[PDB]
Amino acid sequence: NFRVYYRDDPVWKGPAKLLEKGEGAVVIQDNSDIKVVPRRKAKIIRDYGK
Amino acid sequence: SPGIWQLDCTHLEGKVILVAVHVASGYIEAEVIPAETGQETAYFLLKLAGRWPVKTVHTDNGSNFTSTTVKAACWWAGIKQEFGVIESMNKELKKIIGQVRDQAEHLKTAVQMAVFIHNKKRKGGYSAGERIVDIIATDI
Amino acid sequence: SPGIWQLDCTHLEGKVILVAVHVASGYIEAEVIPAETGQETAYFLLKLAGRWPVKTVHTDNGSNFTSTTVKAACWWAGIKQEFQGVIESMNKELKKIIGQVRDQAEHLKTAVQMAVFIHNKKRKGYSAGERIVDIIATDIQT
Amino acid sequence: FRVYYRDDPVWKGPAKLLEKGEGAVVIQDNSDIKVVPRRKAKIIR
Ligand SMILES: Cc1ccc(C2CC2)c(-c2ccc3c(c2)CCCO3)c1[C@H](OC1CC1)C(=O)O
Ligand SMILES: Cc1ccc(C2CC2)c(-c2ccc3c(c2)CCCO3)c1[C@H](OC1CC1)C(=O)O
Ligand SMILES: [Cl-]
Ligand SMILES: [Mg+2]
Ligand SMILES: [Mg+2]
């Protein structure tokens, strides 16, 4: 439903699983690694086309 | 299938031409992009997906097609990615461009003239532009 | 008529958005052009004419629409030019969808195409993208 | 079969194509016989 794309490296990483959305950061899981990414450096894109 | 497309890049005069073909009809769309990047490729797909029911896109392993930006566009638009119709179409497009090249200053103008000529030509009888509209309307 | 279109330019973030609407269906196509000139307008029409059976285009008296470059493009593609409500109402509708999704993308051109996608895929059920394909295919098959 | 040209950066035309040379084109615009260089002419079929 939701997929998160992020930057750590200007190359955009992802897609990652959305674990939690905070007011200043998002918690994601890329592969087996849990990452905390600020809101400004993340893109939570929904499968709108469906 | 009415929703399968093939995309690939061809080159003329040092410029990058991104071509999309509707496999079931031969209908084509092309655009000269300033760089062969995932950002330009994803923007091309977003425009295409808003015009036609794009369900599956078949490309080679080009770095612009496997880029993260394209994956995000296909995910948002609900497009599935899979990795000789498009190759035969690039040569067909290149041939019409060479026949009309001297009629325009810019290559991008000749490209769209060639896309116009290809999509409007009947077999001998429907054109590729008529077939894709026919195939999609029947699917509705 | 299945071949009547309306074209007009709107502005957001200092950028020029050229919009084309299929009157009989409400289907839209938009593009952010680097300049509001006849050359950019003619190139847009050449892409549109290779896409749909464009027979008549209705515009205002903007200098880009009355330019010689656009007249040359309309002649080559066999397009008749005529010089309101539909495109004016569609510029506001497009701007409304862009404002709802603007923060989802860095570039304005990404938001315009997301809004074009949203507008053409929204049903009522019949969506605008389904209507133009249905209207044009009915003219072909009959 | 149609010639657009520049005499003024505004493109003039359409004019009738009479002859296409390697460095110039002979055209008729309105009732005038004009001769225009190749670089300042658009010969569209
Ligand atoms: C730059 C330029 C300047 C003047 C004109 C015309 C005669 C005034 C054109 C032009 C327009 C339409 C057209 C053709 C040429 C040739 C065949 C298809 O229809 C162009 C054209 O680019 C513009 C984006 C289309 C180009 O690439 O030459
Ligand atoms: C510049 C940039 C960088 C990274 C990405 C993505 C994160 C991988 C995207 C992007 C691509 C597709 C997409 C979205 C964003 C959001 C919703 C619709 O689908 C863009 C995008 O521009 C690209 C020409 C579309 C923009 O304007 O933000
Ligand atoms: Cl937080
Ligand atoms: Mg390739
Ligand atoms: Mg206007």
PDB file of C-alpha atoms in Angstrom, chain B residues 47-97:
ATOM      1  CA  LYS B  47       2.726  11.439 -18.767  1.00  0.00           C
ATOM      2  CA  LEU B  48       2.142   8.156 -20.608  1.00  0.00           C
ATOM      3  CA  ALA B  49       0.271   6.535 -17.710  1.00  0.00           C
ATOM      4  CA  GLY B  50      -2.099   9.504 -17.533  1.00  0.00           C
ATOM      5  CA  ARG B  51      -3.048   9.034 -21.199  1.00  0.00           C
ATOM      6  CA  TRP B  52      -3.336   5.249 -21.648  1.00  0.00           C
ATOM      7  CA  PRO B  53      -4.074   2.290 -19.346  1.00  0.00           C
ATOM      8  CA  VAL B  54      -0.409   1.385 -18.864  1.00  0.00           C
ATOM      9  CA  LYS B  55      -0.352  -1.952 -17.026  1.00  0.00           C
ATOM     10  CA  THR B  56       3.032  -3.476 -17.919  1.00  0.00           C
ATOM     11  CA  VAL B  57       6.205  -1.905 -19.324  1.00  0.00           C
ATOM     12  CA  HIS B  58       8.984  -4.017 -20.858  1.00  0.00           C
ATOM     13  CA  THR B  59      12.473  -2.492 -21.002  1.00  0.00           C
ATOM     14  CA  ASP B  60      16.071  -3.647 -21.167  1.00  0.00           C
ATOM     15  CA  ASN B  61      18.485  -3.338 -18.226  1.00  0.00           C
ATOM     16  CA  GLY B  62      19.284   0.315 -18.923  1.00  0.00           C
ATOM     17  CA  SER B  63      20.276   2.178 -15.773  1.00  0.00           C
ATOM     18  CA  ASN B  64      17.547   4.759 -16.393  1.00  0.00           C
ATOM     19  CA  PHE B  65      14.897   2.021 -16.555  1.00  0.00           C
ATOM     20  CA  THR B  66      16.134   0.241 -13.405  1.00  0.00           C
ATOM     21  CA  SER B  67      16.516   3.504 -11.474  1.00  0.00           C
ATOM     22  CA  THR B  68      14.776   4.151  -8.167  1.00  0.00           C
ATOM     23  CA  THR B  69      12.914   7.163  -9.587  1.00  0.00           C
ATOM     24  CA  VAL B  70      11.250   4.990 -12.235  1.00  0.00           C
ATOM     25  CA  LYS B  71      10.292   2.370  -9.639  1.00  0.00           C
ATOM     26  CA  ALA B  72       8.545   5.081  -7.618  1.00  0.00           C
ATOM     27  CA  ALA B  73       6.652   6.303 -10.686  1.00  0.00           C
ATOM     28  CA  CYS B  74       5.559   2.796 -11.682  1.00  0.00           C
ATOM     29  CA  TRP B  75       4.502   2.088  -8.096  1.00  0.00           C
ATOM     30  CA  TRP B  76       2.445   5.283  -7.833  1.00  0.00           C
ATOM     31  CA  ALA B  77       0.833   4.724 -11.249  1.00  0.00           C
ATOM     32  CA  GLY B  78       0.288   1.000 -10.654  1.00  0.00           C
ATOM     33  CA  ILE B  79       2.637  -0.163 -13.410  1.00  0.00           C
ATOM     34  CA  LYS B  80       4.394  -3.532 -13.420  1.00  0.00           C
ATOM     35  CA  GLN B  81       7.953  -3.617 -14.756  1.00  0.00           C
ATOM     36  CA  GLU B  82       9.393  -6.516 -16.757  1.00  0.00           C
ATOM     37  CA  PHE B  83      13.019  -6.849 -17.833  1.00  0.00           C
ATOM     38  CA  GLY B  84      12.081  -7.253 -30.821  1.00  0.00           C
ATOM     39  CA  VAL B  85       9.095  -4.979 -31.370  1.00  0.00           C
ATOM     40  CA  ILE B  86      10.700  -1.859 -29.889  1.00  0.00           C
ATOM     41  CA  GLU B  87      14.013  -2.507 -31.671  1.00  0.00           C
ATOM     42  CA  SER B  88      12.218  -2.821 -35.014  1.00  0.00           C
ATOM     43  CA  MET B  89      10.326   0.378 -34.180  1.00  0.00           C
ATOM     44  CA  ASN B  90      13.433   2.458 -33.437  1.00  0.00           C
ATOM     45  CA  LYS B  91      14.759   1.681 -36.919  1.00  0.00           C
ATOM     46  CA  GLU B  92      11.338   2.426 -38.414  1.00  0.00           C
ATOM     47  CA  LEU B  93      11.236   5.727 -36.517  1.00  0.00           C
ATOM     48  CA  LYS B  94      14.806   6.561 -37.556  1.00  0.00           C
ATOM     49  CA  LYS B  95      13.875   5.934 -41.195  1.00  0.00           C
ATOM     50  CA  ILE B  96      10.897   8.309 -41.239  1.00  0.00           C
ATOM     51  CA  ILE B  97      13.026  10.937 -39.467  1.00  0.00           C
TER      52      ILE B  97
END
